[PDB]
Design a protein around this nucleic acid. Structure first.
Ligand SMILES: Nc1ccn([C@@H]2O[C@H](COP(=O)(O)OP(=O)(O)OP(=O)(O)O)[C@@H](O)[C@H]2O)c(=O)n1
Ligand SMILES: [Ca+2]
Length: 425
DNA sequence: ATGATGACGCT
DNA sequence: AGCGTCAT
């Protein structure tokens, strides 16, 4: 009772850019703004593969991974922007650079963990503490939270009026006098996230959504509840009702085989149903670490820290060669390894200038035709010089003998070069 | 014939 | 070391 930890020790946000690649292309090309549009990679095969979709185009059913020719069937007026292609492969440099624009703004407010090209977690616990002292005991005005939803409220007209009704019920109940109230801490966290999101939009033109809660899993779930261009506060108290109809696969790390096995072995559907099992029962089905994690998570409790990490730990370059394009001669394999190695050298050289580090290991991964796995084979070698001809030759040497005989058999459907094991320089 | 990319766990 | 899982 008095010794039951409630997982309310931190304020954590997750910031997620809305249709990110689309916003990057729309900033650059005003003719694309406020239109059904998508970002595509390649072009010759069925018009290219869709990677990102504006909310106007999503209303027609356009989705990621769809071929652009097929998307045009659902949305004949769909506008398209193409990803840059360099040395025969898609070149995402424009979007990584726009990502850095955003991450550098967020880093002004708190330590961030880069979660992907367009997501970062924020540990706001200290910023909230400082802000709670500056705001003496003053109440929090609804005007400081103009894009915030309070999940679960209102309880007991149009979209915006309902948002404000919920926000009013939340603020009216807040114990402003208690500087240790977790609900007050989340609310201040949301005020800071409003400021952070305003700064991102002012300084880059980009809109985003955010979740604010007590841990990373709840912040990530919260972020998706009201997209786009809104933020959502998930309090500890909101968790039982929210989890009572929340499919297990929606929780971060439960979207794959482990989540499917929770459903199958326990015969449940929703995250809240996990509360009925003991920690030992969950550890027996899913392992010590997974069971302890599940036991706490279904109660809204998670301790995974926001890691102080803005830079990737690996830098990689990959390309698929599907169907009849599979690489089937030694010259082909060697030419494409050179193309990937040239793009990788370019990124590594910029990384060494920008971030004062050198990679020391080169990982080479290939996929062989007829293998459903992401990678058929991984080998490593020393990365001593940032020279593309050397890296591609080393990569070849390391995979040479996977060839079961001028010809390459079986043909390669993927090539992957990854620079890893960075050291300060 | 979705991709390109990246983190981390298990052994 | 090398493979498997899960994610944007
Ligand atoms: N299966 C996926 C999902 C995402 N991504 C990468 O992650 C980026 C951002 O993904 P995501 O946040 O899922 O999509 P958005 O386009 O930003 O849409 P949303 O508004 O839903 O966040 C994409 O551009 C893409 O580069 C990817 O490569 N493969
Ligand atoms: Ca996004």
């Amino acid at each position: 009772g008095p010794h039951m930890a409630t997982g309310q020790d931190r304020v954590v946000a997750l910031v997620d850019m809305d249709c990110f690649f689309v916003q990057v292309e729309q900033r650059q090309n005003p003719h694309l703004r406020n239109k059904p549009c998508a970002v595509v990679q390649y072009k010759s095969w069925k018009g290219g593969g869709i990677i990102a979709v504006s909310y106007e185009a999503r209303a027609f059913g356009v989705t990621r991974s769809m071929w652009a020719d097929d998307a045009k069937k659902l949305c004949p007026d769909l506008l398209l922007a193409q990803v840059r292609e360099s040395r025969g492969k898609a070149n995402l440099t424009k979007y990584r650079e726009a990502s850095v624009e955003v991450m550098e703004i967020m880093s002004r407010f708190a330590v961030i963990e880069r979660a992907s090209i367009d997501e970062a977690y924020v540990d706001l616990t200290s910023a909230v503490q400082e802000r709670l002292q500056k705001l003496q005991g003053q109440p929090i005005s609804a005007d400081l939270l103009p894009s915030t939803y309070i999940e679960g409220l209102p309880q007991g007209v149009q979209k915006e009026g309902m948002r404000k009704q919920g926000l009013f019920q939340w603020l009216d109940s807040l114990q402003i006098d208690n500087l240790t109230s977790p609900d007050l801490q989340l609310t201040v966290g949301a005020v800071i996230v409003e400021e952070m999101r305003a700064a991102i939009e002012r300084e880059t033109g980009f809109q985003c959504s955010a979740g604010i809660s007590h841990n990373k899993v709840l912040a990530k779930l919260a972020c998706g509840l009201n997209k786009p261009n809104r933020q959502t506060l998930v309090s500890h108290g909101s968790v039982p009702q929210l989890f009572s109809q929340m499919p297990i696969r929606k929780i971060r790390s439960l979207g794959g085989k482990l989540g499917a096995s929770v459903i199958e072995i326990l015969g449940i559907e929703y995250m809240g149903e996990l509360t009925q099992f003991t920690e030992s029962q969950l550890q027996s089905h899913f392992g010590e670490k997974n069971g302890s994690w599940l036991y706490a998570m279904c109660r809204g409790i998670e301790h995974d820290p926001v890691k102080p990490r803005q830079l990737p730990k690996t830098i990689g370059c990959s390309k698929n060669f599907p169907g009849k394009t599979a690489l089937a001669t030694r010259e082909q394999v060697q030419w494409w390894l050179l193309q990937l190695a040239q793009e990788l050298e370019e990124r590594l050289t910029k990384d060494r200038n920008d971030n004062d580090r050198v990679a020391t290991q080169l990982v080479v991964s290939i996929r062989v035709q007829g293998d459903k796995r992401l990678s058929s084979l991984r080998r490593c070698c020393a990365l001593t010089r940032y020279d593309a001809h050397k890296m591609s030759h080393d990569a070849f040497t390391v995979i040479k003998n996977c060839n079961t005989s001028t010809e390459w058999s079986p043909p390669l459907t993927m090539l992957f070069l990854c620079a890893t094991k960075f050291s300060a320089s």
